[PDB]
Amino acid sequence: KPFSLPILTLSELTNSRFPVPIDSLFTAQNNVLQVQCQNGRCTLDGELQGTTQLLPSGICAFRGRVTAQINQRDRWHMQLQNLNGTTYDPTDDVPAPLGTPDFKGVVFGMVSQRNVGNDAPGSTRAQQAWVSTYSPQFVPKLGSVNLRISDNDDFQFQPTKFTPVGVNDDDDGHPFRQWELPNYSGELTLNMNLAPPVAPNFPGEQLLFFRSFVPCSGGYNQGIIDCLIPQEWIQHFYQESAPSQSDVALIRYVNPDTGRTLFEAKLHRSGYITVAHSGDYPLVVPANGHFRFDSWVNQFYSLAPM
C-alpha cells in the first residue's frame, strides 16, 4: 500500500540494461536524441514494460536452439525461446522476447550448448560468440537471431544459451549506440509495443541515470550503459505493487550515517528520474548514499537545484 524503495547503495545495485553493477550516477544535458530503452522499464506500481523481465541474468541473454547455418558473417541461426525455456510467441504484445538487447551494437559473450535427444545427449560445449544488433538476421521479434562464433567446427544444432559479457562497436564502423533501438523485426520493418520515450518536461530539469561502465573487447569505447532505474528497484516495485498516488514521487538521496539529505529528485510514475541541473555532470556523492521515498507530489513540483 505505501510506496517505497529498496535501501541499497550504488555498489549494491545492478544495471537494468546490462548485467553488471552500477558504477555511478550521471545527469545528461537535454538533447534532440530520444531516450527510449526497452530493458529497465517498470512503473512505480510494478508494471514491467518493453522487453523488461526480472532476472539480472536474463538481461541481454538469449535462450533457444541453433537450427541452421548460413554463408554470412552472422552465420548461426538461433531459434529463440523465452528465457525460462518456454515457447516464444511472436504475436505477444512485446517488442521482442524479454531480455533482448535494446541498443545498436555488438554484444560479446559466450554460447554454450547441452545436447538432448538422439545425438550424444548430455554432451556440452562452449565458446566465445557475438551478437550484432545491426545484423539483418537480428530479428528477435520474429523469433531468431544469428550468432557469430569463434570456432565454426565445434557447434551443433542443439539447445543453446548466450551469456553476455560486454559490448562494443562493430569492427566495420557500425558504432555502439546505447540510445538507438535495433530493428527487432529486421530491415524495412518498424518496432511495436515499445515502452514510450522519456524526457523531462519541466524547465531546468534533466534525466538522472544509473551508469555502468561495462566491459569492451578491444579499442577505447568507454562501455557506458545508462539505465533509468536499477534492476533491484524494478524487482521491488514488482513485489510491492503499491498504487501510485500521483505522477511523481519525490525522492531524497540521503547519507545514512550523518542523516543528511544531499539532493532531491523526481521519480516519475512511469519509472524514470529527473533532477534540476544544467549540463552533463557525473554526481559527486558519498559511497554509503541511497535514495529514499519522501512524498507524492506532481509534475510541476519545483526541485531544489542539485
Ligand X SMILES: CC(=O)N[C@H]1[C@@H](O[C@H]2[C@@H](O)[C@@H](CO)O[C@H](O)[C@@H]2O[C@@H]2O[C@@H](C)[C@@H](O)[C@@H](O)[C@@H]2O)O[C@H](CO)[C@H](O)[C@@H]1O
Q: Which of 124, 152, 239, 302 binds ligand X (CB under 6 A)?
A: 124
Which of 27-35, 65-73, 117-125, 135-143 is the region at the interface with ligand X (rule: CB under 6 A)? 117-125
Q: Which of 117, 173, 218, 259 binds ligand X (CB under 6 A)?
A: 218
Closest to ligand X by CB, 128 or 245: 128
Q: Which of 65, 75, 125, 174 binds ligand X (CB under 6 A)?
A: 125
Residues 266-285 that bind a second copy (CB under 8 A): none
Q: How far apart are CA 116 and CA 186, in angstroms?
A: 30
Within 10 Å of residue 173's Cβ, how many Cβ atoms?
6
Element (H, E) at 294: strand 290-297
Q: With binding defined as CB under 8 A, does residue 122 bind a second copy?
A: yes
Q: Judged by CB under 6 A, how many residues of this single chain contact ligand X?
A: 7
Helix (DSSP H) and strand (DSSP E) numbers for the chain: 1, 14
Q: Which of 165, 195, 249, 267 binds a second copy (CB under 8 A)?
A: 165
Q: With binding defined as CB under 6 A, does residue 150 bind ligand X?
A: no
Q: Which of 291, 238, 230, 222 is nearest to 15 (CA)?
A: 230
Q: Cα angle at 32 between 190 and 60, to 5 degrees? A: 50
Q: Which of 24, 30, 156, 163 binds a second copy (CB under 8 A)?
A: 163
- Residue 231 backbone phi and psi in degrees, to 5: -55, -40
Q: Nine-digit cell at 55? A: 532476472
Whether 95 and 51 have beta carbons less than 8 Å apart is answered as yes
Minimum CB separation of residue 223 from ligand X in Å reads 13
Whether 20 and 214 have beta carbons less than 8 Å apart is answered as yes
What Å distances lie between residue 304 and 189, 202, 244, 265, 288, CA to CA? 44, 13, 23, 8, 22
Grid-cell match 552533463, residue found: 280
Residues 205-244: x/- map of binding to a second copy (CB under 8 A)? Answer: --------x-xxxxxxxxx--------x--x---x-----
Grid-cell match 525461446, residue found: 81
Closest to a second copy by CB, 201 or 222: 222
Closest to ligand X by CB, 126 or 285: 126
Chain residues that interact with ligand X, rule: CB under 6 A: 123-125, 153-154, 218-219
Chain residues that interact with a second copy, rule: CB under 8 A: 6-8, 11-12, 14, 19-21, 54-58, 83-85, 108-110, 112, 114, 122-128, 161, 163, 165-166, 213, 215-223, 232, 235, 239
